[PDB]
Ligand binder design. Structure first.
Ligand SMILES: O=C(O)[C@@](O)(COP(=O)(O)O)[C@H](O)[C@H](O)COP(=O)(O)O
Ligand SMILES: [Mg+2]
Ligand SMILES: [Mg+2]
Lengths: 118, 455, 73, 452, 227, 119
């Protein structure tokens, strides 16, 4: 048998256990998102710590990030999204970057994953 | 060592030779498996997934020591006549149940085994409770003797009536009818299970009017009278409020529904009734969805035992006169299971285990459902003077009104009791004694003209 | 007490109420009933002026099987 | 002739029901439906007892159909007035509709199939405490189904040992853990120590990976006071979720708890115990589609819906129909799945379905097809039965799900091409390889008893 | 998708052809606008600043989906005789109100529209409450029949009287007059809206004296009396 | 003072304009909870008028979205934020979830700028 390393092994939610993602894989989900008529958006933050409170159920700290510009309404091509990512990477090179999606009919997000690490 | 993989059940859960202990719980189901599986595997499978077992071997078991905690099938018997039916017997250790909880026992014994893709039907028949698990319960609030002392009524069965098809009535009209019936000569008066709080009648004013009627009816006769008030609700705060108001008005008895309300609320109500000095009447609704078919469900004699330990004073049991021979033996057996203190084994009456109750009070049975004056001696001779007889359309159907309707029933009951206390046989004479008593009561006559003889 | 292949009370024939016999359609005593306790002229000693009576079998239901005509068990 | 009105125009504030009946030989059908309606509402066809205005308090039959393929089977429709029920009480409704019609001796069997609740009656209930969207927003998890596991053996383990397993299981990659339904308070382990050890394990596991974790704490008890005592401690410690059994406990107790959970911001998980005693035979009892509606009205967040490839019965079509009646908002009528009436929920939150009962890695592709990414999947023996341990077992379960999610999104089939998705993923994962070798040929196939 | 700037209201809040549903709340105001504005724009402005709307286009609206939540003017009729008077009709979705609260409905329907500098007058006339919003209220405590049963009085209207201007009176003199009037033969007896607690008479002793008078008046006649 | 004089028929209209309250009657009331000086001392802001903003659209947004806007607005330089007057408790958003998300946004915004904020 082997032992799972417990020391310095952080994880970042969805698609963090599969092998690293490539640019082809990246520009494959953006298309799946567009085929279902959803709205993309970008977010950035320099840390990922989680904090709790003494006796308040359902309260956690560290869930909100910072929005890049504004949600890309009326977007029908993927290319545009990839350019905006390079702009964000150039702007702040010491932060995490995330990609989101949105459904206005049920009022809820649909996917999220990381594309850059410090 | 640990060996990952799947194995059979009859390798650790079938103990043909095993001697039961006094502190054990025993059960008995009848089963009918699917084509392909040997009976031994089926029985073992049932006990396995009801005590401590899964489907693929785990490692956390080599640190707890089984053998001390595990159920065991120790006998299988084929059923005559049927081709694919057998009776199984499982034994359960005592350290697996929580004290004073019927919910835990019910959720452990029957929780997920009635839905496996390897059986086609199942039915629970009987249970044996050791005298070390029963002593942790409270039981009925008062019992039989204490209630009779409280009411000061000896020697004869009690009488009652129910407000039949008469809904959409205002509170005042309800109270008037209650007063008339109580002044007639009866003892108790029921309500209607489907009446809690509706736009045509709320509960507080109905309580007020019934309480007003009870005292004024009581003053003229000098006897203790009562009326059951329904306390079933949607939350636990409403039920407690209604019980507290009923106590505040000084009423002697309440009523609850325990199959559609739950065991937890019933136990809470029983504790409150014991604490504050009230009587509890239990009605059984929706029971026919479980205990009717012969090859699937749970028999009523188990629910009777469950109700005895949770707590209650009266319970419905149905009529038994229209039952032919062979039958009505089951009813006579499970009445004894409710009233007696020590019951021996008898397969002809549907008793599978010997039961000891170590000084627990009894429960009064109730009979009802379409009965008239001509059925008096039979019911007196079957049950004895330890029951409650409820009349429906046989009281409100009299051609002269509600008050004269009760006089006929009272006279007939007194005549039957007097005839029994003289040596005359109540089974053969029957129709004859009623006629003689009818020759000095104009109200017994007229009633003997709307309702004909037996045969 | 049911008509051929039909859960309907044969007596009341789906009505619930039958006719008074003591007066047999009249509502007037035709003799001195009992013994000096009833005369021959006043309302019938039973229906008391109605010529009506509940049906013994169906207690006003019109049909048989039910929680008003059957036993229990 | 009277309790049978073959023209009545059903109103929009009435409650409708549909039974299937098996009359005795001789009894005509249009005579039994009238008897069922009368014996459910008042119990008479004559007016000998009224003349006291009634009629406005009676149910009536308004349609009858024959069942195709069977010579003795019919469907009856009954309508009830609105003023017969008390607002905000499921106990009453159940007592008034079903509480005397199942002993009728003129019939041989009876089964309730569906019910229609009008919006004028649904608005008086509270409903689920939080719903679906609010829970996802609270937990911060999007884009994939959630995962969980139950602890075994059931009955026999201590409190320190119980907590040592939760940590190793939770540290491996799962999201939730659960207590068996028959674990309340026993001589070998009492509840107040189990709570503390579980809380410590949860905190230690959360500090390590960097994601939010939880565990369902059982709160069933024998009295209401104890049940309410066992929830205030969980509120004090800061735990996010609790569990309750609603069929052996009661509807009155479930409603009291739902109110408390809404007041104090907790999540409620429900377990369906003893339900198989009522709905397994296809000719007697009450279908589950009715109990599911009743629970959605009473209050809850999760509910067990069963699998279709496990150790317990369950049919595809029927399931696909009641998972929408539980998740959706407006549902049309389709008899190819078991919908007899149309349903409108006038903006009431939804309930998450749960699947559990003898399942392993060679079942992910299907489960992911039948249910979308709006469910929870549980694996008890599939995790604690791995040849290595609990952490190695949890990692293998997460990798399979991630691979399945990526495949579908890339636009590939799952029914046709599923074994490949698993075989290709096992190449780079040393933990997934071991599991696949242990449970290769283990399936469950028998004849269905509740066909349709 | 976002275009910063100001636009007209009659471009999203005027639906000439709309079929109302059975779970909707309906209203009817009569209006008289200022010289310059067409009636349609006026009606649309009322519906907007009472449901969901501002004055300069916001971006957070492309994530909530309107059409589901929004008021709509669907008819306008001129008032005969008058030269500048019209009747409007607005519809309100049911998911905009809180159950069991009259304050919320009143503050939503009429909150800030009676003070816009584009109208000169407004008046609300009627409202239609669906049978799905009313079932969440309790209503009167008892009603009509229950009160008559409680008082045991049938067949005729009830009688009453009110203490006329006799202020600056002590409690005993108040109770004496109440007793006299009740013994006269009436049923009820009122008070005075402008009498709560004042230096010349506090409330507890007035309650005590009235309660003392009621019983003694009731004993002599055998009928139920109140105050 | 006003409860019957506005129905007098002998008149056509009536309007109340002003009142004078003597000090012997004002001393029996409590008055404002804190006032003007105390609030400025509590908030530590002196020299200029304060600023604020209301959230739109009114009716239609969820609780997570409502809180995401407060942060971006508060992090920019304002002092206060407000709920519309018709926002109480509705099927689309309950109050106990709004309160928690707003509190989290307020704390996160306060930790960044270096000044006291509120809503
Ligand atoms: O107790 C059990 O058997 C389970 O934990 C499954 O365990 P394994 O997965 O370890 O076998 C679940 O409670 C059952 O699936 C309940 O069935 P349902 O979902 O029908 O209520
Ligand atoms: Mg389990
Ligand atoms: Mg505003």
């Amino acid at each position: 048998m082997q032992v799972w390393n417990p020391i310095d092994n952080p994880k970042f939610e969805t698609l963090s256990y599969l092998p690293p993602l490539t640019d082809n894989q990246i520009a494959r989900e953006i298309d799946y998102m567009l085929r279902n008529k959803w709205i993309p958006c970008l977010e950035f933050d320099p840390s990922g710590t989680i904090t709790t409170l003494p006796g308040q159920p359902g309260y956690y700290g560290g869930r909100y990030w910072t929005m890049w510009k504004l949600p890309m309404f009326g977007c029908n091509n993927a290319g545009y999204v990839l350019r905006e990512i390079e702009h964000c990477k150039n702007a702040y090179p010491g932060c995490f970057i995330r990609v989101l999606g949105f459904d206005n009919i049920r009022q809820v997000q649909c996917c999220a994953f990381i594309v850059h690490k410090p | 060592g640990f060996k990952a993989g799947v194995k059979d059940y009859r390798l650790t859960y079938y103990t043909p030779d095993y001697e039961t202990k006094d502190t054990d719980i025993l059960a008995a189901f009848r089963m009918t498996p699917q084509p392909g599986v040997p009976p031994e595997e089926a029985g073992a499978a049932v006990a396995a997934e009801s005590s401590t077992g899964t489907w693929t071997t785990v490692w956390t078991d080599g640190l707890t020591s089984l053998d001390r905690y595990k159920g065991r099938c120790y006998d299988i018997e084929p059923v005559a006549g049927e081709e694919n039916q057998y009776i199984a017997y499982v034994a359960y250790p005592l350290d697996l149940f929580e004290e004073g909880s019927v919910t835990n026992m019910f959720t452990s014994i029957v929780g997920n085994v009635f839905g496996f893709k390897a059986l086609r039907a199942l039915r629970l028949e009987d249970l044996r409770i050791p005298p070390a698990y029963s002593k942790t319960f409270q039981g009925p609030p008062h019992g039989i003797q204490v209630e009779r002392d409280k009411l000061n009524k000896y020697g004869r069965p009690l009488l009652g009536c129910t407000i039949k098809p008469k809904l959409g009535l205002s509170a005042k009209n309800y109270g008037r009818a209650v007063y008339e019936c109580l002044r007639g000569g009866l003892d108790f008066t029921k309500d209607d299970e489907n009446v809690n709080s509706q736009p045509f009648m709320r509960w507080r004013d109905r309580f007020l009017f019934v309480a007003e009627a009870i005292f004024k009816s009581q003053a003229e006769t000098g006897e203790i009278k009562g009326h059951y008030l329904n306390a079933t609700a949607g939350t636990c705060e409403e039920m407690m409020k209604r019980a507290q108001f009923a106590r505040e008005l000084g009423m002697p008895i309440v009523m609850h529904d325990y199959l559609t309300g739950g065991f937890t609320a019933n136990t809470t109500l029983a504790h409150y009734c014991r604490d504050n000095g009230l009587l509890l009447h239990i009605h059984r609704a929706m029971h026919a969805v479980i205990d009717r078919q012969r090859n699937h469900g749970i028999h009523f004699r188990v629910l009777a035992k469950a109700l005895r330990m949770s707590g209650g004073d009266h319970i419905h049991s149905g009529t038994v006169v229209g039952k032919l021979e062979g039958e009505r033996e089951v009813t006579l057996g499970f009445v004894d299971l409710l009233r007696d203190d020590y019951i021996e084994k008898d397969r002809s009456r549907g008793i599978y285990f010997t039961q000891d109750w170590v000084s627990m009070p009894g429960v009064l049975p109730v009979a009802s459902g379409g009965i008239h004056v001509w059925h008096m001696p039979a019911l007196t001779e079957i049950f004895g003077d330890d029951s409650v007889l409820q009349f429906g359309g046989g009281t409100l159907g009299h051609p002269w009104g509600n008050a004269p309707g009760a006089v006929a029933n009272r006279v007939a009951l007194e005549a039957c009791v007097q005839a029994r206390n003289e040596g005359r046989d109540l089974a053969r004479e029957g129709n004859d004694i009623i006629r003689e008593a009818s020759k000095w009561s104009p109200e017994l006559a007229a009633a003997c003209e709307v309702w004909k003889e037996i045969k | 007490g049911t008509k051929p292949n039909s859960l309907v009370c044969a007596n009341c024939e789906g009505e619930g109420c039958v006719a008074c016999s003591q007066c047999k359609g009249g509502g007037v005593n035709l003799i001195d009933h009992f013994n000096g306790q009833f005369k021959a002229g006043a309302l019938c000693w039973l229906c008391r002026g109605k010529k009506e009576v509940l049906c013994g079998d169906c207690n006003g239901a019109g049909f048989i099987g039910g929680f008003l005509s059957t036993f229990d068990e």
